[PDB]
Symmetry: C2
Subunit: 127 residues, 2 copies
């Protein structure tokens, strides 16, 4: 038996800005447009479907975390540095300009254009 | 890049109520308590990390969709029926008590205790 998470919606101020930011940074294909969504496809058969928030007022920041290889971490963190992207070792953003070494891996937090708390890491939690 | 979505937070009024509801209904392992989260583990190397969100007034409904086998659909839909769980064929909840046939599969929508728009399906979109 195998119940998979296939997609989840992330509400943002500008779906194209957030989805393209994430695809460019993570080195993924250009988001595909599907109805009101900018669809960001991840490798494990799941997508983040970015959608413009049509309520009021501020976005409540969510959290998405991405598991990547060591080689991918080097390239993606390289884009964080080269692009001047704010980043932090910790989820509460008190440790700017550092990465963490949780689980003997590497991890770092950054935000999408709407302020969601994004995270990349090379080892799963507790591994 | 082979970037995986590893976890995402879902904000709810009661993390234990929502995670237990989803795990019971979908036939998943009992949610694990990790820090402030009730962690719902899916098969494709991703978890939904339910977290208490008790400010604001109402939860702004999100959307998570789960890809399952035909046999799992039969079992999960049987639990939807047995539990008296409200369900709809469509994302806008205009078609109560129907299953949809999108992509030649089967799909249905229902809500968690906090009003998030949950979806189960037997085929990926466009397949
Ligand atoms: Fe995280
Ligand atoms: Fe959906």
């Amino acid at each position: 038996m195998a119940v998979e998470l296939n997609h989840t919606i992330v509400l943002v101020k500008d779906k194209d800005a957030s989805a393209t930011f994430m695809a460019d940074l993570l080195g993924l294909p250009k988001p595909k447009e599907m109805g009101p969504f900018a669809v960001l496809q991840l490798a494990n058969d799941v997508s983040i479907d970015f959608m413009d928030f049509r309520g009021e007022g501020d976005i409540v920041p969510g959290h998405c975390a991405f598991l990547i290889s060591d080689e991918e971490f080097d390239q993606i963190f390289g884009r964080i540095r080269e692009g001047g992207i704010e980043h932090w070792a910790d989820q509460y953003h008190r440790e700017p300009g550092r990465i963490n070494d949780r689980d003997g891996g590497r991890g770092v937090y950054f935000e999408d254009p709407s302020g969601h708390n994004m995270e990349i890491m090379t080892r799963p939690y507790g591994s």
